[PDB]
Design a binder for these strands. Structure first.
Lengths: 266, 213, 244, 199, 298, 123, 60, 222, 236
RNA sequence: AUAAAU
């Protein structure tokens, strides 16, 4: 996104590619920038969140539910990604959409048992993402918002019996009463590769000079798929040694619980 | 639809040892082309890669080249359009390190990869991950056949859903694709795909020598 | 299954309001400083609208450039989660939406001289987060606030209002249920005047009613206009206090 | 404030007043003291002088036109500062950005209360900023080029020349009325006074 | 492509409107006479207003209703512009400002207003429904496209007949026009569209505060008058003493009193137009058979 | 063809020691390299006043030498020397028969007897 | 309405009709000499003649 | 061959016409030469924008074929080298099919060719020659060659044909065959018997066409 | 004797005929053949050896030719010339600034975009942008070409405009002079400029010329002016 | 040398 001159980029590379790596800001290779998160502001929805970054990057997530027959509806969690002033079709949109749907699959990184109502019916979860503004790869930004939203989601409570095979009662839900959606949303961390250094939460200027990048998912206190290498820019993309890949996975594996801990506060 | 002939809209669709074959330069419509066919067990994959470029962009001030990759469904409609865009983004993240961009200022290279077929057999009492190393093989051949300068030969392998692309004789990595499968397969997949890379590399080099001869 | 009425003999509506009550109004300026030159977050009832004004700035294509006036663009994003029932498809290409966008442009083309920013472009991006009747009127108020925040010159305020009609008497500021129950009139009012920028009637309306309905709307819009001035001035007082 | 436009005095109605004695100048001064606005112009010569010299000054009231020998009265003209820096008397110039400099240099004269019709013309967005254009369309008068390239130094000044010296200010106050009024109407008057103060 | 108009024309027409004069020699409240010609087939109607020529064609085919509305048939209105009406129009430009407006005015006047009984378009609930289509063809332009189209759509729908149907569950034999006569489509009301153009006097002197220059407003402006207008207003009225729809987006800001006056003036026009339209429907209905009385059963 | 200049498109480029290098591109898109021949670069004889209509013609093939790159839009082309000018051309913008180069400022057609004024080169 | 004195010269941020002078923006009323203007609370930066600015090339 | 045509019926177009054969009624309009879009520009010749609108519904791939065949006829007719880097918009609005459009497009194509030619004449665009088009069909039992067949005749046909010839020298010399679109299967003897009788009725049509052109246009001239 | 395209030509091949509108000389076969439909007009001078011809045909799309009087509208200004379009959807024409009386490289003309100008086409090539000049040498010492002020412009087919400019037997200018004073500019590009002292008279002239353009009748036109100037009275 | 490269 950001446009920089050849001189500025080289200086940034020198600052960040140094053996004692220094952020232009001054951050450490594992320090995130401060974010603000709002939740439960959309009463029309079952759950909602709004995340604001330090560079003005803003993302809004909404959670809606629908009763479906899990015998015909394979995917019980659908992620939808959007950006105002941006066409839906764009390569970045579909890629993030495809990626996010894999991160939150029914039988991969999500306890889909908590969505089951009866033998025959279950709750389909629609996770709608709206990226108002972003200056870098918003994959990690969206991930934090989806997490916050799914941890403050409330679904209707069933009243009728849960055996459609025999008695076959029509799904009825008691008025007013609702049950909080107990689930373990995964997180998606993005890393930047500048020389032999690995940075958590790459800034805009940092990503521009990066040699490569990593997209690493996180669930149940361990590294999980999808794991994707990603070109943060397209002018300075280079191959990387395998030890860097193992360094990145190790880096996430030790700093993720700290992030989750700061994120798990109700 | 006023663009194509979709037919009746009230109707419904139908409801019910590694071996390689390489051929390049069989299309006179573009600057470089490649055919890749792989058969393992009951599963086989045949795809065609077409390269158009490098062609000048009017008014372009870019000091380097610009690569665009798009995957298409030739016959069987299986893979989602959203997923095709994702792989395309992954593929471009690879060849932007492979292709010597400094050679083509104010220019752009368009890469079309037609997935005409893949055959899948599943027994009854990811998916596109297996095709990825073949797409990389096809593109690297089509680019080298077209005359595009490549810093190194790009190749990859698929091990338990974990795809990783290598250059500089497996010493470094230009791409990494992990979906599902199992944990703690880091060291194993890196070694198994490195063998597939070296195997795919030599056959790719021999391919150019054969057709070029 | 249920049934419901419109206006009871007790003068009460389906939601509890009487015939002449405005919903809860909350207004908010400078909500997205790092994303736009001007921004506003509107809460009119359950309606939630983000409005972003980007400009005046250089056009991205020299082909689309006017040397006499700025180019004004408006894109309304009605999100798939704006209603109770999530819409499967996108609403962007919908002829109903194109008319809305066109309508809003026509309205403000006569309200900003748009002769003092030549060779520039003003892009207005709108995101409707939640919808509950009178969304057109709320769209108007969101743009007016955001444009002012951007320091873009305009002749006067444009306030938008929603009108609901039952039998003899219309109901001020209609929600979705009332909108469903009865025909509504959407009014664009310029400043404190009697002049309408936008007159929108999409359903059948007795001809006797309109003169009186218009009278109610204009009076209500004046109250809305007064509130908006209070909303910004009050914020300024609050901001100054925060600074102190 | 918008006011009815006062036309220029009819041509041949009055002779231009030649000012080349201290006495005539003092009379002229007493006269300008009685105006609410005056129009001013100069002629400048730079071929037979290193920096240049101010050869003529033209001043018009609503009633009369003055032509001032700034050669003979070089050391006398400073007394006009009473009127030229009196802020309650508008001084109307067209294309005066250089003329402001030269008044200073040569005569020690300053202007407080300037209205420059060039900025007026620009702010209004007239197609052409040329001074003659105004004469051509409003005074029905045809401008003449040729004398200017010569030397205004020679005397006595030619009768044809006097119109050209006469022409420059004879018409300007009305043009000021018309431009002023439209600027007020157009919400652009404040801008022109700002530019005029910068000049 | 931008049309070129001389500064002299813009000054001439504007000054003429201040003198209550116009190029085609009309009044301010006067609407150009509308000529309606029916073709051989039902649903074929040609509307002409001065030089303005529009043609509408009504068609229908067996289709299945939406899941949401199992009792309602399908109805769509097409108004795609073409370079035939003038090179100012781009072929297929269905997103332009004027195009989308016109498309929305007609839709809110006929579709949304429920001028057509879509409930009577249902053959078997949730299974088979008639799908009525109104295709408007803008043959040439001399302004007043919206007014021409509304007349064209309504005259066509009231003209139109749909093959008689016998239904027994899921099997229906559509009787041909040879076998049995076709059935006319149901109408709830007859909406008429009026277009108003607003102008500015640009005059130095007004004689009185009490009586003033005010605002310029004419009815059904020509192509030359449509380019010079500062405001656009379209009000749709019927003979039922009610407002179908009214669309004013921006333009020259006007009082609520002025809009009412235009609305009341339009009502006198839509009355004359509706009766005239019915008359030409009556003349064409009796026109079709040379021997119909000899034909009759009842 | 314009009045003060004449813009073209680059097809092939002459090699060095005849052989040529053909640049393959779509002529119905605009991806082909465009070049502009100035009116002063038409001929060394009378550089000031040159009638462009009597020199080139839409569709005519012109052999030239590029003085400079210019901007991204137009290359700079000169036909000042003798071996440069219109090589292949037809009568009436290509409607008539083939024409050949005789005089440097005259092109004739030994088929229909038609003669059109062009800027011809030397074999 | 800011003032009703027709003597004023209306500057930026204002507009007028006969004697009445109104505000076009939200800001503070400014009076410099005879020039009445309203200084906005927000808006785009404005280039004055002689300013020292730093800029990044957009197009050539 | 009792066709009827009118010329110059549209106001906001350089040229227009309305051709009617039997039921089949087509109105055509022509604007040009005018400024072309960049993608339309031809360095040396005139660019043709050809549009065909159906009587019912919107334009589909069917009309895209009607546009293509109509292009093959109009292209060599127009002296295109007279208008380099220029555009000529040609729009055909079929008002009445005069045939089962679900089965045939014969009469609509011929009527579009005749109407387009007339519109080009009205617009005053350089034409190399004249042109006329007729629809022809063959019967299932009788196997007779019927020129200008009715809709009912088409239903019972074995083959359908569109013939458009290029005429010069006062409409007496066939310069070339612009378009022959034969769908069906054929015998040689029938083809030339068709061409012999077809040429006669075509020549009679031109004579009638010349009469119509002179009668309408002469009052305008001095 | 109406003439149609592809019509046989009586004249012998050896003897040349001067080109006229409607007449086309094939660049390939060198044959002279009519391409327009209308009345053939031929002028013969001297006992033997010279000829000229053209066809009067109904066309409304103007094509610039040398020495043709046209009325154009200047949409925009370039570096050294005005862009003026004679007709809508028609190629732009190049008007030189230096193509004015008392021209100089220091002072550009005061013509603004939207002004009407009377002009003559100097150089008009088929494959090159056409050019017009404000002053035409052929007419006289003074062209009488200057930008028009106010008035009203009228669309008219090329035939009607050509008859109005070159034919003195055309009663239109006479029947209009019998009703009011008026000045008129006539362009061969099918444009007619009319201006009177009062708008009602100019409007009346506009309506007459339009009907005359529509009517194309000598008898009708005299009456037409009668009913038009009459109708303005009551309308007043 | 009285206002130069939309």
């Amino acid at each position: 996104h950001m446009s920089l001159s050849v001189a500025e980029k080289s200086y940034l590379y020198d600052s960040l590619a140094s053996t004692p790596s220094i952020r232009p800001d001054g951050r450490l290779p594992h320090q995130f920038r401060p974010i603000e998160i709002f939740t439960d502001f959309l009463p029309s929805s079952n759950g909602s969140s709004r995340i604001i970054a330090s560079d003005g990057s803003e993302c809004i997530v909404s959670i809606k539910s629908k009763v479906v027959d899990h015998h015909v509806e394979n995917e019980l969690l659908q992620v939808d990604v959007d950006i105002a002033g941006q066409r839906d079709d764009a390569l970045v949109v579909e890629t993030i959409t495809s990626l996010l749907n894999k991160v939150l699959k029914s039988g991969s990184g999500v306890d889909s048992s908590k969505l089951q109502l009866t033998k025959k019916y279950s709750f389909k979860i629609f996770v709608d993402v709206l990226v108002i503004s972003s200056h870098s790869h918003p994959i990690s930004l969206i991930s934090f918002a989806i997490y916050s939203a799914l941890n403050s989601t409330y679904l209707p409570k069933l009243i009728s019996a849960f055996d459609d095979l025999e008695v076959e009662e029509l799904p009825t839900f008691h008025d007013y009463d609702m049950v909080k959606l107990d689930i373990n949303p995964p997180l998606v961390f993005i890393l930047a590769v500048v020389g032999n250094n690995m940075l958590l939460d790459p800034a805009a200027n940092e990503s521009e000079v990066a040699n490569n990048g990593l997209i690493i998912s996180w669930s149940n206190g361990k590294i999980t798929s999808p794991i994707r290498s990603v070109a943060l820019n397209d002018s300075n993309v280079k191959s990387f040694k395998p030890h860097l890949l193992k360094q990145g996975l190790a880096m996430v594996e030790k700093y993720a619980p700290d992030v989750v801990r700061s994120l798990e506060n109700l | 639809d006023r663009r194509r002939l979709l037919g009746p809209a009230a109707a419904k669709p139908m409801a019910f040892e590694q071996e390689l074959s390489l051929h390049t330069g069989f299309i006179e419509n573009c600057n470089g082309s490649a055919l890749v066919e792989a058969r393992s067990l009951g599963h086989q994959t045949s795809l065609i890669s077409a390269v158009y470029g490098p062609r000048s962009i009017r008014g372009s001030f870019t000091s380097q080249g610009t690569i665009s990759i798009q995957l298409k469904n030739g016959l069987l409609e299986k893979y989602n359009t959203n997923e095709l865009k994702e792989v395309s983004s992954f593929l471009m993240g690879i060849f932007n390190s492979v292709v010597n961009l400094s050679r083509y200022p104010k220019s752009g290279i368009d890469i079309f990869v037609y997935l005409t077929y893949d055959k899948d057999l599943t027994n009854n009492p990811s998916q596109i991950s297996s095709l990825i190393p073949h797409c990389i093989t096809s593109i690297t051949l089509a680019l080298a056949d077209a005359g595009i300068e490549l810093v190194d030969m790009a190749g990859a392998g698929e091990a338990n859903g974990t795809v990783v692309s290598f250059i500089k004789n497996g010493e470094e990595i230009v791409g990494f694709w992990k979906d599902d499968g199992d944990d703690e397969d880091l060291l194993e997949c890196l070694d198994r795909c490195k063998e597939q890379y070296n195997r795919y590399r030599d056959l790719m080099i021999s391919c150019l020598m054969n057709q070029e001869t | 299954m249920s049934r419901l009425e419109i206006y009871s003999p007790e003068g009460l509506r389906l939601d509890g309001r009487r015939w002449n009550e405005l919903r809860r109004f909350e207004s908010s300026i400078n909500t997205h400083p790092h994303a736009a030159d001007g921004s506003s977050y509107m809460e009119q009832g359950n309606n939630k609208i983000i409005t972003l004004v980007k400009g005046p700035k250089e056009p991205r294509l020299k082909s689309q450039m006017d040397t006499s006036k700025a180019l004004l663009n408006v894109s309304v994003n009605i999100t798939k989660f704006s209603k109770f029932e999530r819409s499967k498809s996108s609403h962007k290409n919908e002829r109903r939406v194109l008319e809305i966008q066109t309508s809003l442009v026509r309205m403000f083309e006569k309200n900003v001289m748009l002769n003092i920013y030549p060779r520039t472009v003003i892009d207005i991006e709108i995101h409707v987060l939640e919808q509950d009747g009178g969304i057109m009127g709320s769209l108007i108020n969101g743009i007016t606030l955001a444009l002012i925040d951007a320091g873009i010159s305009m002749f006067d305020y444009i306030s938008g209002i929603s009108v609901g009609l039952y039998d003899t008497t219309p109901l001020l500021d209609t929600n979705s249920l009332e909108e469903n129950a009865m025909s509504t009139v959407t009014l664009g009012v310029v400043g404190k005047s009697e002049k309408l920028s936008l007159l929108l009637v999409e359903d059948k309306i007795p001809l006797d009613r309109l003169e009186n309905v218009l009278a109610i709307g204009i009076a209500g819009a004046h109250r809305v206009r007064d509130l908006m001035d209070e909303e910004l001035r009050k914020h300024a007082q609050k901001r100054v206090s925060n600074a102190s | 404030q918008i006011r009815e436009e006062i036309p220029s005095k009819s041509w041949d109605d009055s002779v231009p007043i030649w000012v080349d004695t201290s006495t005539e100048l003092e009379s002229m001064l007493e006269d300008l003291k009685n105006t609410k606005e005056i129009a001013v112009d100069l002629e400048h010569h730079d071929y037979r002088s290193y920096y240049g010299i101010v050869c003529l000054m033209q001043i018009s009231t609503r009633e009369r036109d003055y032509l001032v020998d700034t050669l003979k009265l070089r050391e006398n003209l400073h007394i006009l500062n009473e009127v030229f820096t009196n802020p309650s008397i508008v001084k109307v110039f067209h294309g005066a950005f250089m003329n402001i400099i030269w008044l200073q240099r040569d005569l020690g004269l300053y202007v407080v209360g300037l209205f420059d019709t060039y900025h007026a013309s620009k702010a209004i967005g007239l197609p052409r900023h040329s001074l003659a254009y105004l004469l051509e369309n409003f005074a029905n008068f045809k401008t003449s080029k040729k004398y200017q390239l010569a030397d205004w130094r020679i005397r006595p000044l030619s009768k044809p020349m006097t119109a050209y010296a006469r022409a420059d200010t004879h018409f300007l106050l009305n043009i000021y009325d018309q431009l002023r009024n439209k600027l007020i109407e157009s919400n652009k008057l404040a801008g022109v006074l700002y530019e005029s103060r910068n000049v | 492509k931008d049309i070129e108009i001389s500064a002299s024309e813009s000054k001439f027409i504007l000054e003429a409107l201040r003198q209550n004069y116009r190029l085609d020699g009309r009044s301010f409240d006067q609407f150009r006479d509308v000529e309606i010609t029916f073709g051989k087939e039902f649903g074929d109607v040609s509307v002409k207003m001065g030089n303005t020529k529009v043609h509408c064609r009504i068609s229908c085919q067996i289709a299945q209703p939406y899941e949401d509305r199992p009792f309602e048939g399908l109805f769509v209105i097409s108004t795609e512009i073409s370079p035939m009406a003038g090179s100012q129009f781009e072929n297929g430009n269905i997103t332009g400002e004027d195009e989308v407006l016109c498309s929305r005015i007609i839709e809110k006047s006929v579709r949304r207003s429920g001028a057509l009984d879509v409930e009577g378009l249902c053959i078997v609930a949730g299974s088979k429904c008639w799908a009525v289509r109104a295709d408007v063809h803008f043959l040439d332009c001399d302004g007043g496209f919206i007014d021409a189209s509304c007349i064209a759509v309504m005259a066509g729908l009231m003209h139109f007949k749909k093959p008689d149907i016998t239904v027994h569950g899921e099997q229906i034999i559509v009787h041909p026009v040879n076998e049995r006569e076709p059935v006319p489509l149901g109408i709830l009301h007859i909406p008429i569209c009026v277009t108003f153009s607003f102008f500015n006097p640009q005059d130095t002197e007004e004689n009185i505060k009490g009586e003033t220059n005010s605002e310029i407003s004419i009815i059904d402006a020509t192509l030359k008058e449509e380019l010079l207008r500062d405001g656009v207003l379209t009000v749709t009225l019927n003979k039922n003493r009610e407002v179908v729809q009214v669309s004013k987006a921006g333009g020259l800001p006007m009082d609520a009193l002025t809009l009412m006056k235009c609305c009341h003036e339009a009502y006198s026009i839509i009355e004359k137009i509706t009766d005239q339209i019915l008359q030409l429907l009556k003349e064409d209905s009796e026109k079709r058979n040379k021997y119909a009385a000899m034909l009759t059963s009842e | 063809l314009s009045l003060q200049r004449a813009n073209v498109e680059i097809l092939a480029v002459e090699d060095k020691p005849a052989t040529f290098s053909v640049s393959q591109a779509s002529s119905d898109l605009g991806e082909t390299f465009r070049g502009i021949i100035r009116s002063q670069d038409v001929r060394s004889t009378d550089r000031d006043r040159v009638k462009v209509i009597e020199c080139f013609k839409p569709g005519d093939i012109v052999r030239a030498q590029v003085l400079s790159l210019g901007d991204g839009t137009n290359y700079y082309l000169t036909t000042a020397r003798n071996d440069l000018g219109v090589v292949f051309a037809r009568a009436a913008n290509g409607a008539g028969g083939l024409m050949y180069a005789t005089d440097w400022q005259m092109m004739t057609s030994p088929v229909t007897g038609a003669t059109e004024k062009r800027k011809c080169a030397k074999p | 309405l800011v003032t009703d004195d027709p003597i004023w010269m209306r500057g930026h941020g204002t507009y007028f009709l006969d004697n009445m002078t109104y505000s076009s923006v939200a800001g503070t009323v400014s009076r410099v000499n005879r020039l009445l203007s309203v200084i906005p609370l927000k808006g785009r930066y404005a280039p004055e003649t002689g300013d020292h600015v730093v800029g990044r090339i957009a197009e050539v | 061959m009792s066709v009827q045509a009118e010329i110059g019926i549209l106001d906001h177009v350089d040229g227009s016409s309305e051709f009617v054969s039997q039921d089949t009624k087509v109105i055509c309009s022509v604007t040009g030469p005018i400024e072309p879009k960049a993608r339309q520009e031809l360095p040396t010749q005139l660019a043709l924008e050809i549009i065909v609108r159906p009587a019912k519904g919107v334009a589909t791939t069917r009309e895209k074929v009607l546009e293509d065949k109509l292009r093959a006829v109009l292209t060599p007719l127009i002296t295109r080298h007279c208008y380099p880097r220029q555009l000529c918009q040609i729009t055909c609005q079929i008002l009445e099919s005069g045939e089962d459009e679900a089965e045939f497009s014969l009469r609509e194509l011929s009527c579009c060719i005749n109407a387009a030619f007339l519109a080009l004449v009205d617009a005053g665009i350089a034409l190399n020659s004249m042109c006329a088009s007729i629809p022809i069909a063959i019967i299932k039992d009788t196997s007779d060659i019927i020129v200008d067949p009715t809709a009912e005749q088409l239903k019972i046909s074995l083959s359908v044909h569109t013939l458009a010839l290029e005429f010069v020298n006062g409409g007496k010399v066939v310069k070339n065959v612009l378009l022959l679109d034969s769908n069906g299967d054929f015998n040689e003897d029938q083809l030339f018997s068709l061409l012999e009788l077809g040429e006669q009725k075509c020549q009679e049509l031109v004579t009638n066409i010349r009469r119509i052109i002179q009668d309408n246009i002469s009052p305008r001239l001095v | 004797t109406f003439i149609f395209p592809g019509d046989s030509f009586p004249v012998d091949p050896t003897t040349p005929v001067k080109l006229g509108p409607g007449i086309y000389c094939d660049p390939n076969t060198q044959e002279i053949r009519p391409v327009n439909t209308g009345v053939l007009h031929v002028s013969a001078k001297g006992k033997s050896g010279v000829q000229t011809a053209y066809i009067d045909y109904s066309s409304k799309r103007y094509i610039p030719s040398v020495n043709d009087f046209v009325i154009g509208v200047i949409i925009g200004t370039f570096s050294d010339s005005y862009k003026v379009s004679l007709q809508n959807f028609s190629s732009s024409v190049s008007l030189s600034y230096m193509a004015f009386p008392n021209a100089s490289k220091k002072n550009r003309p005061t013509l603004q975009v939207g002004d009407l100008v009377y002009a003559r086409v100097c150089t008009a090539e088929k494959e090159l942008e056409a050019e017009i000049e404000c002053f035409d040498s052929t007419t006289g010492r003074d062209a009488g070409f200057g930008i028009l002020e106010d008035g009203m412009i009228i669309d008219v087919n090329l035939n009607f405009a050509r008859q109005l400019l070159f034919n003195n037997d055309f009663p239109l200018l006479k029947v209009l002079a019998a009703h009011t004073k008026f000045e008129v500019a006539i362009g061969l590009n099918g444009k007619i400029w009319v201006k009177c002292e009062e708008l009602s008279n100019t409007l009346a002239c506009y309506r007459t010329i339009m009907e005359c353009c529509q009517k194309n009748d000598t008898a009708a036109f005299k009456d037409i002016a009668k009913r038009q100037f009459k109708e303005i009275l009551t309308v007043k």
